Amino acid sequence: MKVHSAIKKRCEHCKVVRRKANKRQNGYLYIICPANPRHKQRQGYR
Amino acid sequence: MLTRFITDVSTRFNPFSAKAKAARLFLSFLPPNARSNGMNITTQLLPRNSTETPLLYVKFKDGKEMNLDVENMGIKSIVEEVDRHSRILQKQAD
């Protein structure tokens, strides 16, 4: 995982999802990729 | 559709009959190497003047024999039944 301020898709399998958003926080934007786990990225700091 | 588990298929229908449309689509789903694998298929075309009831014949590699009328059920409904028997065989093999 890499926490960038500018997350981008690096292949055709990379998906942009917002996870960890619940009634207590807003969550982060994630780049999830099942093909290459090196494309895992996050946007924002806890 | 899963065709690997099908041994033989024999379809007897008339082209002009609209009901036979479902029987025709079924023939197209078969893969190209179906002839090489050894599966046997015989197709009979009915005369145009008089059309008999369309007949559909299917056989799985477990000896089971399926026969479903073409007029009553549509093409989508036929694909459903054939997959179920083809599915349970896969779960059994594993």
Binding site: - | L27, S28, L30, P32
Partner: protein
């Protein structure tokens, strides 16, 4: 300079985009149904490239052995086995059957100079044609009585069509015995004369081609009916027989 309202003379207002292949291919089928008297419709099942070439290799060879010494036009290479778009080829029938060109009223059009000139839009890709086929297709039972209706079931699934420039029974026997053999009427080529026919690639390709129906002079014909036409030695000689009576 060209004005805004000016439209190119070779590009009248079409019903839908013309650059796309969907409509560009529709204009071809519309003209294939008019210039092709004898047309046979087959069904191809995921044939490979090498197998397609092999299937088209026997036709050319089989169609080159047709005796044509009467100095007639060389109709031995314009016969192609073409894979067509079944969906877009279905609209072709409607356009010929349900659209009448003589029912369009001419309108004044602007050229490059801007002068008004009378023009009529009768191209198959026009908005008038699209409106005619749609309204005509609204009636279901009446369409079945037309020749298009007698071919609506045929236009389902992948379809490969054979196009002959003219109605020559000799050219049919050379193509009806290589694609749909049925002895003793149309027996397959012999093994000691045409070994290429019975090849692993070709033999496996002919099993995937089925002749479901045929179209002749805009008239639907059943598979058994095609045999009657092919059985005739020649169309010309058939007429002389009636004269002797």
């Amino acid at each position: 300079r060209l004005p805004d309202d000016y439209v190119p003379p070779t590009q009248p207002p079409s019903a839908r985009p013309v650059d796309t292949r969907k409509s560009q291919l529709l204009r071809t089928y519309t003209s294939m149904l008019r210039s092709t008297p004898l047309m046979l419709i087959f069904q191809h099942n995921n044939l490979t490239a090498i197998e397609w070439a092999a299937i088209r290799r026997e036709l050319s060879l089989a169609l080159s052995n047709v005796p044509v010494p009467e100095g007639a036009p060389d109709i031995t290479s314009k016969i192609h086995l073409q894979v067509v778009r079944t969906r877009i080829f279905d609209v072709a029938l409607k356009t010929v059957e349900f659209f009448d060109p003589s029912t369009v009223e001419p309108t004044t059009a602007t050229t490059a100079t801007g002068t008004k000139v009378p023009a009529t839009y009768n191209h198959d890709l026009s908005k008038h044609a699209w409106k005619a086929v749609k309204e005509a297709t609204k009636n279901t039972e009446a369409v079945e009585k037309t020749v298009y209706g007698q071919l609506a079931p045929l236009l389902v699934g992948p379809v490969a069509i054979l196009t002959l420039p003219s109605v020559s029974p000799a050219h049919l026997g050379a193509a009806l015995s290589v694609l749909a053999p049925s002895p003793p009427a149309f027996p397959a080529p012999s093994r000691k004369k045409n070994p290429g026919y019975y090849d692993l690639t070709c033999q496996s390709g002919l099993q995937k081609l089925l002749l479901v129906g045929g179209r002749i002079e805009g008239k639907a014909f059943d598979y058994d009916g095609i045999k009657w036409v092919g059985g005739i030695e020649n169309g010309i000689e058939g007429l002389r027989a009636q004269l002797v009576h």
